[PDB]
Design a protein around this ligand. Structure first.
Ligand SMILES: COc1cc(/C=C/C(=O)O)ccc1O
Ligand SMILES: COc1cc(/C=C/C(=O)O)ccc1O
Ligand SMILES: [Cl-]
Ligand SMILES: [Cl-]
Ligand SMILES: [Cl-]
Ligand SMILES: [Cl-]
Ligand SMILES: [Cl-]
Ligand SMILES: [Cl-]
Ligand SMILES: [Cl-]
Ligand SMILES: [Cl-]
Ligand SMILES: [Cl-]
Ligand SMILES: [Cl-]
Ligand SMILES: [Cl-]
Ligand SMILES: [Cl-]
Ligand SMILES: [Cl-]
Ligand SMILES: [Cl-]
Ligand SMILES: [Cl-]
Ligand SMILES: [Cl-]
Ligand SMILES: [Cl-]
Ligand SMILES: [Cl-]
Ligand SMILES: [Cl-]
Ligand SMILES: [Cl-]
Ligand SMILES: [Cl-]
Ligand SMILES: [Cl-]
Ligand code: NA
Ligand code: NA
Ligand code: NA
Ligand code: NA
Ligand code: NA
Ligand code: NA
Lengths: 250, 250
């Protein structure tokens, strides 16, 4: 604001769970604010999200970034996380942002599964959200779950198990049952204001086809396929994601 | 079971909220079990649900009935309840039931909004649930929210307010935003096993058309329109609801 600029930790509550977040506060009495959502098994402080928040702050756009339930410093077992309860987390975050007297326009920025959270939240609040940026939005998590193949781990999609060991973690069967019937594009398409879609051509985790499909469904979208970039826009590719996001939001 | 028959309180946890429930335990080493879901602003112990549980118990069918978040003895503010987080509650209840070594077949029985919870849960677990009974299932809550008229209380459906005073309570705006885009029939229709639909012709809260539509969409359903009955199957009508439910489940 006019007096404090910098970072601050903030905590919010959603159903008895504490969500831990970082606010980047810019100069100015009035500013726009982005809510930035991390991906599946990630957290609020990846290099990609920190560099996005820093870049927005340099253009006087505030941001908040929270750990979802089951991730980072927030409460809840990973096994009990779904995309649905992350959308519930995102709504709790939005409640906090929309009541802040400094905030002019609200933007959503979401990476990978956080992009599905962002796109569906904007579709639920198309009257409120002003712009959305999706980075490799993981809409394929639905098709994956219907196929019975989630990042190399296979199961019977007709009889999903109670829980699914997944790397060092345990993925909830209810995550997958939700994923199969999530109305990702139906809800997302209700947002008719500007959307920026950014996807790397060498993304091996989520096909760039997800972003091509969003670009089809959205009334006002711009698609940027980043030649050579991977799922996390790592290393040499990271500034493509940071620049496009910053330029789009202003 | 073989040794204890009667009622017991049980508590479960869903995201940091405690859910309080009543188990009716019948005679027998092995038995079927019904999960019974109450409606909007109701609780696990209405006359209708108690008489259903008692009748099932007299035919050796066990049951559990929990207060949803925001209701009765369970945790959470009413203002923070949605149909989605009630489905999350219902899944937590199902986790408890499906791991009980006595239980053979699992049935869902839901009244009004609890019928929407039941129908969508069965659509997420069509491999597991064996039969469903819906009593005046409140699928019209979606159309109501799209119209901007929820039980006489009107608002702008294009810009739903943060919160909506509703009788002695405060309904969350996010309840209504969820309601508008809930894929009630899409998810519900994935359950292809037997469904019993029961609806009173004088229901002034949820049109009997909701149950006519479920009967259209379901592969294996039976519709019973109860001439003269109201939304709660109150008084002279209550045994229509209890009898049909009991006969259907066995
Ligand atoms: C769990 O299902 C999936 C999730 C991811 C998430 C990616 C991201 O968050 O980076 C991608 C594909 C899937 O099938
Ligand atoms: C909140 O929206 C509604 C919910 C009800 C719930 C009825 C029941 O649980 O008895 C019916 C119509 C509605 O528009
Ligand atoms: Cl100030
Ligand atoms: Cl705080
Ligand atoms: Cl600044
Ligand atoms: Cl991320
Ligand atoms: Cl990192
Ligand atoms: Cl940093
Ligand atoms: Cl840092
Ligand atoms: Cl403006
Ligand atoms: Cl859903
Ligand atoms: Cl689709
Ligand atoms: Cl490029
Ligand atoms: Cl026993
Ligand atoms: Cl217990
Ligand atoms: Cl008995
Ligand atoms: Cl009820
Ligand atoms: Cl009563
Ligand atoms: Cl009683
Ligand atoms: Cl009693
Ligand atoms: Cl059997
Ligand atoms: Cl949904
Ligand atoms: Cl529909
Ligand atoms: Cl009759
Ligand atoms: Na404004
Ligand atoms: Na293209
Ligand atoms: Na990759
Ligand atoms: Na069995
Ligand atoms: Na009819
Ligand atoms: Na009535």
């Amino acid at each position: 604001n006019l007096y404090f600029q910098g970072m601050a930790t903030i905590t919010l509550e959603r159903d008895g769970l504490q969500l831990v977040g970082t606010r980047e506060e810019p100069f100015g009495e009035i500013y726009d604010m982005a809510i930035i959502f991390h991906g599946f098994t990630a957290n609020r402080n990846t290099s990609l999200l920190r560099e996005i928040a820093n870049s927005l702050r340099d253009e006087n756009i505030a941001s908040v970034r929270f750990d979802f339930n089951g991730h980072g410093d927030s409460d809840g077992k990973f096994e009990n996380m779904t995309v649905l309860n992350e959308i519930e987390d995102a709504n709790a975050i939005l409640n906090y942002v929309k009541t802040d007297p400094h905030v002019r326009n609200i933007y959503l920025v979401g990476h990978a599964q956080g992009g599905v959270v962002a796109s569906m939240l904007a579709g639920l609040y198309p009257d409120l959200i002003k712009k959305v940026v999706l980075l490799a939005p993981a809409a394929t998590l639905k098709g994956d779950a219907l196929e019975g193949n989630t990042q190399g781990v296979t199961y019977n999609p007709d009889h999903i198990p109670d829980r699914l060991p997944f790397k060092d973690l345990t993925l909830g069967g209810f995550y997958l049952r939700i994923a199969q019937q999530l109305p990702i594009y139906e809800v997302s398409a209700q947002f008719t204001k500007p959307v920026c879609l950014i996807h790397g051509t060498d993304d091996t985790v989520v096909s760039p086809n997800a972003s091509k499909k969003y670009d089809q469904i959205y009334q006002n979208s711009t698609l940027h396929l980043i030649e050579g970039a991977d799922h996390c826009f790592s290393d040499s590719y990271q500034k493509n994601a940071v620049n496009l996001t910053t330029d789009f939001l202003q």
